[PDB]
Design a protein around this nucleic acid. Structure first.
Length: 48
RNA sequence: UUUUUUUUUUUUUUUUUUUUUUUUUUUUUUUUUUUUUUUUUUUUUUUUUUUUUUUUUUUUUUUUUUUUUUUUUUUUUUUUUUUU
């Protein structure tokens, strides 16, 4: 989902586990914005 | 200055009780009976040079004021009278 070039890789292995693959797909976009610990204090970043 | 008061008068031996009387061995149980190897998976397949900009153009002396003018001696009071 993140790297466009990544996806031409061949990953048709026997331990794909699509359920965890789907969760990763949802993690990139549908999970959340993902704001990590901010050294700079952005108090108005809720709308950001 | 001083003027009062300021000894003593009771009670204060003793009378009970104070040995002992129960109980105080023992009576169960107390081996063991399962299970206890193993059977998957486990190489790799993307991307990964570069393409902009990047000298300078202003201003930048000075113009005022800046001596002084008053006042500045003194004028009271200031022993004692009781009691103890």
């Amino acid at each position: 989902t993140i790297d466009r070039s990544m996806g031409a890789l061949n990953i048709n292995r026997g331990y794909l586990e699509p359920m965890y693959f789907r969760l990763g797909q949802k993690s990139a976009r549908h999970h959340a914005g993902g704001i990590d610990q901010n050294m700079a204090n952005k108090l108005g970043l809720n709308s950001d």
